[PDB]
Design an enzyme around this catalytic site. Structure first.
Site, short mmCIF file in Angstrom:
data_model
loop_
_atom_site.label_atom_id
_atom_site.label_comp_id
_atom_site.label_asym_id
_atom_site.label_seq_id
_atom_site.Cartn_x
_atom_site.Cartn_y
_atom_site.Cartn_z
N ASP A 282 -7.41 -54.50 -8.39
CA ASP A 282 -7.66 -55.72 -9.15
C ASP A 282 -6.78 -56.88 -8.68
O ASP A 282 -6.72 -57.92 -9.34
CB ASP A 282 -7.49 -55.47 -10.65
CG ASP A 282 -6.06 -55.24 -11.10
OD1 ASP A 282 -5.18 -54.98 -10.26
OD2 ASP A 282 -5.80 -55.33 -12.32
N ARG B 67 -7.93 -50.57 -11.89
CA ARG B 67 -6.70 -51.34 -11.74
C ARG B 67 -6.19 -51.20 -10.30
O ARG B 67 -6.41 -52.09 -9.48
CB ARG B 67 -5.64 -50.89 -12.74
CG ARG B 67 -4.36 -51.71 -12.71
CD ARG B 67 -3.46 -51.34 -13.88
NE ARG B 67 -2.15 -51.97 -13.84
CZ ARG B 67 -1.18 -51.67 -12.99
NH1 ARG B 67 -1.35 -50.74 -12.06
NH2 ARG B 67 -0.02 -52.32 -13.06
N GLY C 47 -2.11 -47.23 -13.93
CA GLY C 47 -2.36 -48.05 -15.12
C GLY C 47 -1.18 -49.00 -15.34
O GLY C 47 -0.28 -49.07 -14.51
N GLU D 295 -9.00 -52.21 -27.34
CA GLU D 295 -9.93 -51.44 -26.52
C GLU D 295 -11.23 -51.18 -27.26
O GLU D 295 -12.31 -51.20 -26.68
CB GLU D 295 -9.28 -50.12 -26.09
CG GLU D 295 -8.06 -50.33 -25.21
CD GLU D 295 -7.26 -49.08 -24.92
OE1 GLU D 295 -7.18 -48.19 -25.79
OE2 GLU D 295 -6.71 -48.97 -23.81
O1 LIG Z 1 4.67 -48.50 -14.16
C1 LIG Z 1 5.49 -48.29 -13.23
O2 LIG Z 1 6.64 -47.86 -13.53
C2 LIG Z 1 5.14 -48.51 -11.88
C3 LIG Z 1 5.90 -48.15 -10.80
C4 LIG Z 1 5.47 -48.34 -9.48
C5 LIG Z 1 6.30 -47.92 -8.40
O3 LIG Z 1 7.26 -47.17 -8.60
O4 LIG Z 1 6.12 -48.26 -7.25
C6 LIG Z 1 4.23 -48.92 -9.27
C7 LIG Z 1 3.55 -49.26 -10.47
N1 LIG Z 1 3.95 -49.08 -11.75
C8 LIG Z 1 2.25 -49.83 -10.41
O5 LIG Z 1 1.56 -50.16 -11.53
C9 LIG Z 1 1.65 -50.05 -9.19
O6 LIG Z 1 0.38 -50.60 -9.22
C10 LIG Z 1 2.32 -49.72 -8.02
C11 LIG Z 1 1.96 -49.85 -6.72
C12 LIG Z 1 3.01 -49.39 -5.95
C13 LIG Z 1 3.18 -49.32 -4.58
O7 LIG Z 1 4.29 -49.01 -4.11
O8 LIG Z 1 2.26 -49.57 -3.82
N2 LIG Z 1 4.02 -48.96 -6.76
C14 LIG Z 1 3.58 -49.18 -8.04
CA LIG Z 2 -6.11 -46.42 -24.22
CA LIG Z 3 2.21 -48.91 -13.72
#
Ligand SMILES: O=C(O)c1cc(C(=O)O)c2c(n1)C(=O)C(=O)c1cc(C(=O)O)[nH]c1-2
Ligand SMILES: [Ca+2]
Ligand SMILES: [Ca+2]
Ligand SMILES: O=C(O)c1cc(C(=O)O)c2c(n1)C(=O)C(=O)c1cc(C(=O)O)[nH]c1-2
Ligand SMILES: [Ca+2]
Ligand SMILES: [Ca+2]
Ligand SMILES: [Ca+2]
Ligand SMILES: [Ca+2]
Lengths: 444, 452
Positions: free
Chosen positions: B163, B228, B247, B309
């Site tokens: 997204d 997402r 998410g 939702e």
């Molecule tokens: O909710 C979280 O704690 C968390 C952590 C991380 C992370 O550790 O890289 C990502 C995400 N969310 C996240 O939503 C996300 O789309 C994401 C992409 C990536 C990446 O390295 O490509 N990390 C993360």
């Molecule tokens: Ca939900």
């Molecule tokens: Ca996340």
């Protein structure tokens, strides 16, 4: 899913359907089936009668009455299972399950009857399996024959760990021993989907539990009253949860469905397993708050704290709520359980459409609601793998829907209604004044 | 599912496997595949390099370096998609997707485009030649790019396109397009701006498959919408399409990709339960100087429109097979054990990929029909069991190989007794005690884990 409000239910009148009562004086009509003669065959739980209604005229004849059916006025026992043989033309047999006294207080027997066209009655009785558990609560009893020619039978958890049977140790999780099974000790056959050969014996390809193969197909069920196969061989099911999490499950071999450690998803949301059979002094009162708020002395287990195996979650829940949810809703006058985040699924019917298919009902699952006076339409995808969107309530009325089938062309629905009981009216309040007691009504 | 505690994560050390680091200090290693030559091929997102490693010897070779690969040191863009042609011997083609400058842009950020491209592998020359652009002009940004690219049993390219990070952090006030669909007029001008938060299904030549699902009257490259950041995408042996997705503050997902399915983002995270999350539309915020409380929509600043939702008027909603994790509204998203980095203690695992363990002549006991989901922020490889038909999950997601590493990808050797994983070069990860570190044990590494 999230609970529909009293308002939402009231507006689900299904204006687009013509209502028409076919039968009226019925004694606890339980299940109805589309007979191999294009006639509707239904059962009366208390009396054990097997009716055959002409679906086009409404003329009824009592084909047979199962003898010695036991029935507690306050219970859910009686004539339960009811199915035909896939190839009736060549194998004219009818399968049932009923509450019969046990000389050594009751047992549950799965029995095969032999249909005589000439005399138009049931003869040559053979007990397929007896000694099964019986009580006044959650007997389930849905009996269907699968594409594999096996008898699929749902046997509730006998209502243990609640009401009359509060301090009885629930056995939905329990499996039989080779030693017990050898002595026809089916005490474990509680909260299970049984799968049996047409002679009541154990299929050699049945799932193993504790190194033992028995009639058990799946386990961990409360009151699974719904059981229906899909056109592609999958087994959909509807089940009654506690104060919450009524379910629509996809039955899979050896699948553990979590009850009573888990109601609905394993989310620790709105339900905890309070084991009253392990409470110190059995004088402790069940606060009826779904295990979220319990009286001191009762061992409570979070679903997340359960150390189970092969847990299979529901495809949908009616409904899941949070711990802050109020289980004592004043809107339901005294009958506070009707305001619980459930719908009380009484069955599960897989709509196969036809040359007069209702528009948009492709691949839908029809689930009748006792306490809410509605019939849910649950759409699934073409492969019957998942549900699309929510459960849409239909045919709202002051009635307790018990079962539902559809005609071949598929433009008319036939539903059975409880002779009596509590149902939710248009407001949030409750009544026992049923609009259509013990009836078979038709919606076109 | 209910969140595991730091201690439960901590004991998921996995002693039953031999840990052996093959490579180290790779430049932001992204995806790894098991090559036909029984050698391991992996990608470097930042550089756009494609490396071939010898599983047993560890010999690296930069087979090819995709030219003009754009990458922001702080973003998730760069070389993304990476797939071989199923019958690589008859049909030696490598399929990629990557961030490339878009000469036809009109914006700050949004200067790039995503391009799905085919390369022909030359045996004797040992490098990729004859490049063919299949689908260009795809949305691009620094966040939620996803980019998983697999070749379906139907000979179609299946592609995940995130997204773009809209409605969070640096794109907070950009209107999420996960639920958006292209008009014919847009399709005619090759305007694929609505291709966000989607699983695309396209012909090998890059055109719209004639049997693709319809959305509001138009058949486009879209197969499923409402996503997402679907970084995990893999086909099961029986043709089912399993997916892992990230998410918000919660509700990471394991989804079953269904034709025409609406996976709900952004109106619904995980199940439609109205629990722990709420859709707060920042692009429609009354006063846009307001701040995002980062409390998953349960509690939001004044002026931002919030839609439950259950208030979502969408159709074809398909819920996840499993959520990591779902929590109630009373959940505290401001968890002080993560301190300055309040995001790692959130009830999420940041599923980095999705791999279907196919077993083999040395298959690991009890791993039949499992899905390996590498966790970035938890330093584990979740092993999720499904039934033989891949219809349902059995039990919960079991943590494996706990370590101070950001697991990026995972595959299994053909025999099935060894797992090959990729870890991030830099980033944050949860320690055994629940607190955060950026000190990664095996930065940009290719680790082999061998079973008992
Ligand atoms: O909710 C979280 O704690 C968390 C952590 C991380 C992370 O550790 O890289 C990502 C995400 N969310 C996240 O939503 C996300 O789309 C994401 C992409 C990536 C990446 O390295 O490509 N990390 C993360
Ligand atoms: Ca939900
Ligand atoms: Ca996340
Ligand atoms: O949760 C509820 O409020 C509720 C209501 C009812 C009902 O109204 O009959 C039943 C149940 N639960 C239930 O769990 C159940 O197993 C059940 C069986 C029957 C029946 O009439 O056979 N009703 C109900
Ligand atoms: Ca109930
Ligand atoms: Ca269950
Ligand atoms: Ca639950
Ligand atoms: Ca989703």
């Amino acid at each position: 899913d999230v609970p529909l409000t009293p308002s939402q239910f009231a507006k689900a009148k299904s204006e687009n359907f013509d209502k028409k009562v076919i039968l009226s004086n019925l004694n606890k009509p339980h299940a109805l089936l589309w007979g191999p003669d294009n006639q509707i065959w239904l059962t009366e739980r208390a009396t054990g009668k097997i009716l055959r209604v002409n679906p086009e005229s409404g003329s009824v004849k009592t084909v047979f009455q199962v003898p010695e059916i036991v029935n507690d006025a306050d219970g859910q026992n009686g004539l339960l299972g009811f199915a035909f043989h896939p190839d009736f033309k060549n194998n004219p047999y009818i399968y049932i399950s009923g509450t019969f006294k046990n000389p050594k207080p009751n047992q549950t027997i799965i029995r095969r009857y032999t249909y005589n066209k000439s005399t138009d009655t049931l003869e040559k009785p053979v007990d397929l399996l007896a000694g099964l558990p019986s009580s006044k609560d959650h007997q389930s009893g849905r009996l269907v024959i699968g594409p594999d020619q096996k008898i699929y039978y749902t046997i509730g958890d006998q209502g243990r760990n609640q009401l009359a049977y509060l301090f009885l140790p629930n056995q939905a999780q329990h499996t039989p021993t080779q030693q017990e099974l050898n002595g026809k000790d089916y005490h474990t056959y509680m909260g299970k989907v049984l799968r049996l050969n047409l002679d009541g014996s154990i299929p050699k390809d049945n799932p193993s539990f504790n190194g033992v193969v028995s009639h058990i197909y799946t386990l961990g069920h409360r009151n699974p009253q719904g059981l229906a196969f899909t056109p592609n061989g999958k087994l959909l099911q509807s089940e009654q949860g506690p104060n919450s999490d009524d379910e629509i499950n996809l039955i899979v071999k050896g699948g553990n469905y979590g009850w009573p450690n888990v109601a609905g998803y394993k989310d620790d949301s709105g339900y905890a397993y309070a084991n009253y059979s392990a409470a110190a002094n059995k004088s402790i009162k069940d606060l009826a708050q779904n295990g979220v708020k319990v009286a001191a002395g009762v061992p409570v287990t979070k679903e997340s704290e359960w150390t189970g195996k092969n847990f299979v979650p529901p495809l949908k829940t009616l409904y899941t709520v949070q711990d802050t949810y109020n289980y004592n809703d004043p809107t339901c006058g005294e009958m506070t359980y009707i305001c619980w985040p459930t719908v009380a699924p009484s069955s599960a019917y897989v709509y196969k459409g036809g040359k007069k298919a209702i528009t948009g009902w492709e691949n839908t699952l029809l689930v009748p609601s006792l306490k809410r006076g509605v019939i849910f339409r649950i759409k699934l995808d073409p492969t019957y793998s998942t549900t699309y969107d929510d459960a849409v309530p239909m045919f709202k009325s002051n009635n307790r829907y018990r079962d539902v089938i559809a005609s071949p062309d598929g433009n008319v629905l036939y539903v059975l209604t409880d002779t009596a009981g509590n149902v939710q009216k248009d407001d949030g309040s409750v009544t026992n004044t049923l609009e259509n007691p013990g009836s078979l009504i038709k919606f076109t």
